[PDB]
Structures are given as C-alpha cells and as structure tokens.
Amino acid sequence: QISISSPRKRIYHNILETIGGTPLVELHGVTEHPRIKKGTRILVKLEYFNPMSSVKDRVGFNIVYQAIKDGRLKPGMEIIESTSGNTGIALCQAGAVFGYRVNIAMPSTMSVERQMIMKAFGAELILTEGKKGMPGAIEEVNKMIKENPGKYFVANQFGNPDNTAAHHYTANEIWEDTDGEVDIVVSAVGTSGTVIGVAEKLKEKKKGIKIIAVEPEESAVLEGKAKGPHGIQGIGAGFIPDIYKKEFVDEIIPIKTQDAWKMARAVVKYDGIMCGMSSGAAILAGLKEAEKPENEGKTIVIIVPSCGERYLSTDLYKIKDEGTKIQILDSLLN
Amino acid sequence: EQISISSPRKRIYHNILETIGGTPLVELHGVTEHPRIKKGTRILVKLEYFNPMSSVKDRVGFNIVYQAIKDGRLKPGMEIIESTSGNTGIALCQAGAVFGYRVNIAMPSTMSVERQMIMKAFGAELILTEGKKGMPGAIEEVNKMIKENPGKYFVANQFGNPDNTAAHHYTANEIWEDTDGEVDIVVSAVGTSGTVIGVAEKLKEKKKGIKIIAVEPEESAVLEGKAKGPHGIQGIGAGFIPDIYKKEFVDEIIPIKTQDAWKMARAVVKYDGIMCGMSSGAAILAGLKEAEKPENEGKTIVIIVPSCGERYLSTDLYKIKDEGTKIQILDSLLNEHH
Numbered sequence: 001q002i003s004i005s006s007p008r009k010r011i012y013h014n015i016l017e018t019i020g021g022t023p024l025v026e027l028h029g030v031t032e033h034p035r036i037k038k039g040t041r042i043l044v045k046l047e048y049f050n051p052m053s054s055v056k057d058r059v060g061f062n063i064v065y066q067a068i069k070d071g072r073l074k075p076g077m078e079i080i081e082s083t084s085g086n087t088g089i090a091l092c093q094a095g096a097v098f099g100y101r102v103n104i105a106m107p108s109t110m111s112v113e114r115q116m117i118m119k120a121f122g123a124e125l126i127l128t129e130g131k132k133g134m135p136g137a138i139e140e141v142n143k144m145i146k147e148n149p150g151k152y153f154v155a156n157q158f159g160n161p162d163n164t165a166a167h168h169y170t171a172n173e174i175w176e177d178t179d180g181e182v183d184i185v186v187s188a189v190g191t192s193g194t195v196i197g198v199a200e201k202l203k204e205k206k207k208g209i210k211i212i213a214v215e216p217e218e219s220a221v222l223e224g225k226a227k228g229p230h231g232i233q234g235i236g237a238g239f240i241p242d243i244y245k246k247e248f249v250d251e252i253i254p255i256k257t258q259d260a261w262k263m264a265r266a267v268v269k270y271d272g273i274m275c276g277m278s279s280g281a282a283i284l285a286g287l288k289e290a291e292k293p294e295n296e297g298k299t300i301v302i303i304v305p306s307c308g309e310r311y312l313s314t315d316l317y318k319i320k321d322e323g324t325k326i327q328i329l330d331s332l333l334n
Numbered sequence: 335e336q337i338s339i340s341s342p343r344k345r346i347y348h349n350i351l352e353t354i355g356g357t358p359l360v361e362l363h364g365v366t367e368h369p370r371i372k373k374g375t376r377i378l379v380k381l382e383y384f385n386p387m388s389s390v391k392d393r394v395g396f397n398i399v400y401q402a403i404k405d406g407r408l409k410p411g412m413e414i415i416e417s418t419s420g421n422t423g424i425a426l427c428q429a430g431a432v433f434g435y436r437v438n439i440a441m442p443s444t445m446s447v448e449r450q451m452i453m454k455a456f457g458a459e460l461i462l463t464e465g466k467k468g469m470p471g472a473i474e475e476v477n478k479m480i481k482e483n484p485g486k487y488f489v490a491n492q493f494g495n496p497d498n499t500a501a502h503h504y505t506a507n508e509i510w511e512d513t514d515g516e517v518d519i520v521v522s523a524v525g526t527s528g529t530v531i532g533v534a535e536k537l538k539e540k541k542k543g544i545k546i547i548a549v550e551p552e553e554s555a556v557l558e559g560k561a562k563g564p565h566g567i568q569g570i571g572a573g574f575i576p577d578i579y580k581k582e583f584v585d586e587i588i589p590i591k592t593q594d595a596w597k598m599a600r601a602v603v604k605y606d607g608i609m610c611g612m613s614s615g616a617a618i619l620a621g622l623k624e625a626e627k628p629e630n631e632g633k634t635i636v637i638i639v640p641s642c643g644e645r646y647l648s649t650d651l652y653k654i655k656d657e658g659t660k661i662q663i664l665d666s667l668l669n670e671h672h
C-alpha cells in the first residue's frame with residue numbers, strides 16, 4: 001500500500017514560510033546489494049523540496065531575515081553577494097519578499113540560466129570579467145562597498161554564522177523525523193553551513209552521532225590537500241570556510257567527480273529520485289558507510305542539496321553507464 | 335511579523351511517491367496591492383510545484399499507474415506508453431521508476447529537449463517523431479505501436495482517464511482542510527481538466543456555493559465554444575474539450591491572453607517572490623480579476639499554480655522586461671473593462 005501526503009493544515013503567510021520541513025525518504029533501489037543488510041536504513045533528506053529547489057533557500061532566508069531583525073539590513077540599504085549559484089537565487093527570493101534590492105556579482109561567463117532566474121526575481125546582476133572567475137566578482141563587490149559605504153549588506157555566505165544557524169532547523173527535522181534513531185549524517189560540503197549546523201544541533205541531542213563531510217577527491221581541502229579542478233558543482237570551494245568547525249566533523253570522505261555523477265545517475269534510474277551532483281557524492285559516501293560491518297542496522301541520513309533539473313546543461317546525464325544495476329553498484333563501491 | 339518556517343514532517347517516506355500531494359497554500363500580498371482589491375478578500379495560491387518533480391502532474395502520473403496496477407490494467411511484462419512532451423511524461427517516468435515498469439514517451443523530436451533529457455534520466459524510452467507533424471505525429475506513432483503490439487502497452491491516456499480526475503479529490507481535500515472549510519472560489523487553468531473537475535466534484539460535496547472557475551487562453555477558447563487557435567500559455571489550451579471535462583461542475587470560464595499570462599507570472603515572482611509558470615500567470619490573473627468584483631469582498635479565493643518558472647527558462651517568459659512600478663504593472667493587468 002502506498003499513501004500520498006496528507007494536507008499540511010496551514011496557510012502560509014508568504015513563500016519563506018514554506019522553507020524547511022523537507023522530506024526524509026528511504027532509498028531502496030541503490031541499496032539493493034548483498035553487503036547492505038536489511039536492517040541498515042539509508043535515508044535521503046531532499047532539500048530541493050524548498051521553494052527554489054535547494055538547501056540554500058534556508059541560508060538566503062536566515063541571513064537576510066536575521067540582518068533585518070538585527071539592524072544590519074535597514075530601509076534604503078541593498079543586499080549584495082558574489083555568487084553564481086543557489087545562494088544567489090535564495091538571496092533573490094528573500095529580497096523579493098522583504099522588499100530589498102538584491103545585487104548579485106558573478107563572472108559574465110557563468111550560468112546564463114541562473115542569471116535569468118536571478119533577474120526574474122528583480123536582482124541587479126554585476127557581471128564581472130570571465131577570466132578572473134569568482135575572485136573577480138568578489139573584487140567588484142569590495143569596490144562597490146568601498147565607493148558606497150553604508151549602502152550594502154554583504155551576505156558573506158562562507159563567513160556568516162547565520163548560514164550555520166539555519167541548519168539547526170535541518171538538524172531538528174532529522175531528529176524528529178527519525179524519532180531520535182539517526183546514527184550517521186552525511187553532508188557534501190560547500191559553505192559547510194549544513195554539516196556544521198546539523199552537527200552542532202544533533203550533538204546537543206546525542207553525542208554519539210557520527211558526522212561525515214564529503215568533498216571532491218580532486219579538491220580535498222578539508223583533508224589538507226590543495227584546491228584543484230573538479231566537476232562536483234556546489235561543493236569543493238577550494239578553501240576552508242570561516243564557518244567550518246573541524247571539531248564537529250568525525251570523518252571526511254573524498255569522492256571522485258565521475259563517481260558522484262555516476263551515483264546521481266543510478267539514484268534517479270533505480271529510486272526515481274532526481275538528485276544533483278553533490279547529492280551523488282553524499283549518497284555514494286553513505287552507501288560506502290552502509291556496507292561497513294560495524295554499521296549494520298544503523299540509520300544513515302544523507303543530505304540531498306539540489307535536483308538534477310538544474311544540471312541539464314552540464315555533463316551529468318551525458319555519459320551512459322554500462323551494465324546491470326548490481327554491476328553499476330559494484331563499480332561505484334569498488 | 336514573526337516569519338516562521340515549516341515544521342518537521344514527522345514522517346519517513348517509503349519512497350518518493352509518498353511525497354506527492356499535500357502541497358502548500360500560500361497567501362499572495364504583493365500582487366494584490368491595487369485599489370480595486372479589498373483588504374478583506376484572501377487570495378491564496380496552491381503551489382503544485384512542491385510535488386517531487388515540480389508539477390501538478392506528479393499526482394496524475396502516480397494515480398494513473400497506481401490505480402492501473404491495483405485494477406490489473408497494468409501487470410508485470412507490460413510497459414507504460416503515452417504521447418506527451420510535457421509534465422505528464424515526467425510524472426509517468428517517476429511512477430514507472432518506483433513501481434519497476436518501463437515507460438515509453440512519444441513526442442516530436444524538436445519539442446522540449448530539456449524534458450527529453452529529464453525523461454531519459456529516469457530510464458524512459460523516447461519515441462521521437464517527425465517535428466513538422468507535432469503532437470498528432472506522436473499520437474499516430476503510439477497508435478501504431480499499440481496496434482502492432484496488442485496487450486503489451488498500458489496507455490496513460492491523460493485526457494480521457496478517470497484516474498486523472500480522481501487524483502484531484504486529494505487536491506480538493508487539501509484545499510478544504512487548509513482553509514478550514516472557508517474556501518469560496520477555486521481558479522484552475524485547464525489542460526486535461528483533471529484538476530478543475532476533480533476539485534469541483536469533491537468540494538461541491540463539502541458546501542453549497544463554492545464557485546469553480548476554469549481558465550483558458552483567449553486565443554484558443556474551446557471550453558467557451560470558440561475555435562482552437564495558436565497561443566503561448568504552455569500546459570493549457572489543448573485545442574479540444576477533454577473527455578474527462580464535465581461542464582456541469584464549472585461555474586465560469588475566464589479567457590486570458592498569452593501576453594497577460596506571462597506578465598502576471600513575471601509580476602508574481604518579482605513582487606511575491608513566487609516563481610510560478612505560464613499557466614499559473616493565467617490562473618492568478620483570473621483570480622485577481624475575481625478578487626476585484628464587489629460580490630467577492632471578503633471571500634477566500636484559491637488559485638492552482640501547476641508549475642515553476644525554472645521549467646520555462648528557454649521560453650520568452652522572462653525575456654520581456656516590464657517597464658514600470660508595481661502599481662503600473664498591476665493596473666495594466668487589471669485594466670480591461672466589461
């Protein structure tokens with residue numbers, strides 16, 4: 001028997017109130033492996049259920065809403081951030097609701113898709129020199145702040161603890177949804193707001209929970225390697241964010257870009273869940289935990305930051321995989 | 335005011351299909367700020383893009399496949415087929431993936447390449463038909479395939495399948511529960527008509543006096559008895575009256591111009607921060623038109639929002655950049671006289 005969702009029994013005052021309370025869903029297709037025991041539970045928390053389909057919805061909202069409550073953002077000021085991704089979308093959504101102008105700086109070469117999304121929300125785009133990358137976008141933001149003191153609130157996603165703090169809700173949802181049974185949480189790391197915010201709130205609930213960060217093998221900076229070229233969009237920032245707190249992270253798992261994409265392909269094919277690239281990374285790390293003998297019967301929760309639809313212009317679904325399901329899962333796990 | 339985000343669901347879903355439905359009902363504020371709309375009337379949008387694949391059709395793909403499995407119309411060995419280049423294709427692929435059935439989707443080779451990619455990701459077999467022939471070419475090929483392979487295929491038949499309409503009794507129950515029975519008017523832009531009919535069937539059981547409004551393109555006003563015509567409101571205006579349409583359940587039909595549907599959608603995202611799709615712009619505009627009627631003062635108006643704007647980035651939806659303040663834009667959208 002299969003029951004769909006019941007009424008929410010709420011009228012939301014605006015779209016920001018629909019942020020969070022994201023669903024926790026059992027994996028079955030990709031967990032069908034002789035070495036993963038029946039009792040081991042592998043669950044994915046689908047952050048693309050947020051109104052703009054990513055985990056960053058929580059971040060854009062909390063950063064802006066807190067700044068407004070704080071007086072760090074007040075009438076006549078504008079929001080600014082250098083970002084070409086989900087954070088920019090999330091800031092645009094918050095700014096639209098609150099009635100604050102949003103300025104997003106990114107290299108002109110970037111996501112013309114996400115550019116259009118940001119413009120649709122009424123953002124002013126600051127398109128910087130393509131060859132200078134994100135450093136060039138940050139550079140222009142700093143120049144604008146210098147020339148206009150008092151005008152701008154900078155979101156500062158990698159240094160702002162309102163990022164981290166938003167994920168106390170993420171943690172509370174994992175705790176409640178699992179009835180306190182969660183044993184391990186796996187999170188692919190971009191800003192690190194999720195892994196740290198979740199870790200600190202869950203540790204408050206149960207010290208024994210294992211917290212696993214995931215990063216690209218090609219840019220394993222949390223593990224002390226250097227910034228390198230990789231293809232896992234949304235993670236591998238190439239530095240350790242100021243909001244990172246190593247004390248709260250129990251293990252770091254490196255995942256190859258190609259394996260993350262291949263995992264994401266298997267998850268949509270065998271579970272009907274259209275996860276993004278970083279989710280492929282997290283889920284593979286989670287499956288690797290799930291086959292460990294010391295983890296038999298444990299409840300493993302894996303954060304899924306975004307949906308595959310935001311990746312159609314990428315190479316994510318371009319490579320075809322050879323073999324049967326078990327062949328594909330063996331190739332990922334070996 | 336205090337802004338509070340959503341509480342935990344307090345559920346572990348056995349699979350992705352269990353996350354379908356129970357979509358949020360959200361107040362509009364920004365686009366309702368016009369002198370002709372009274373403070374007391376409540377204008378709400380039901381955001382069907384909260385479904386796992388971001389459209390109302392998740393309910394339809396699911397219920398069509400599930401009810402067919404339960405009935406025995408779909409059984410092991412058979413494959414699912416449908417000619418569709420829209421959201422129904424995606425919803426069938428999602429259902430097929432979870433239930434473990436092959437899904438065959440037919441569409442013109444030139445139509446929605448992005449959602450072609452989405453469907454293939456889900457493991458669907460794409461039947462790409464001659465571009466110039468359009469959807470009739472796709473329907474023709476599905477017809478050929480089922481004729482040659484009797485018993486092999488289960489046809490979803492979205493425009494004639496009572497399981498489409500039936501799925502919307504849940505949509506109706508959600509509207510009913512979320513409004514504490516206060517809902518007065520439901521506005522739905524019509525594609526298959528599953529939503530407007532299924533909602534009407536169930537709500538008309540709850541209380542007398544709930545006004546059911548269908549919305550269609552001004553250019554293809556076939557429900558109002560006008561002739562089929564070219565229009566740009568993706569997801570609606572099929573050009574015919576679907577077999578599941580029941581005119582007795584519909585109180586009024588509102589035609590909306592393509593250009594106005596787009597402009598409304600642009601306004602909703604900019605002033606309410608809600609990224610609704612094209613057909614949503616049509617439904618919302620119709621809803622605001624209801625909200626300005628004096629007989630509707632203080633009523634609760636519920637507008638179906640079938641899809642999100644991100645599915646429209648390759649269209650002209652956001653290419654036109656409206657000049658003018660919020661009040662000029664809203665005033666220009668409501669200014670038609672009748």
Ligand SMILES: *Cc1c(COP(=O)(O)O)cnc(C)c1O
Binds near residue numbers: 056279
């Ligand atoms: C932000 C993001 C992440 C990482 O989440 P953090 O909380 O920033 O570490 C992973 N994937 C995608 C697609 C993201 O946008």
Ligand SMILES: *Cc1c(COP(=O)(O)O)cnc(C)c1O
Binds near residue numbers: 422525526640
């Ligand atoms: C299906 C659909 C509609 C219309 O809903 P019906 O229940 O088929 O009438 C409107 N917009 C979009 C984008 C759709 O996919």
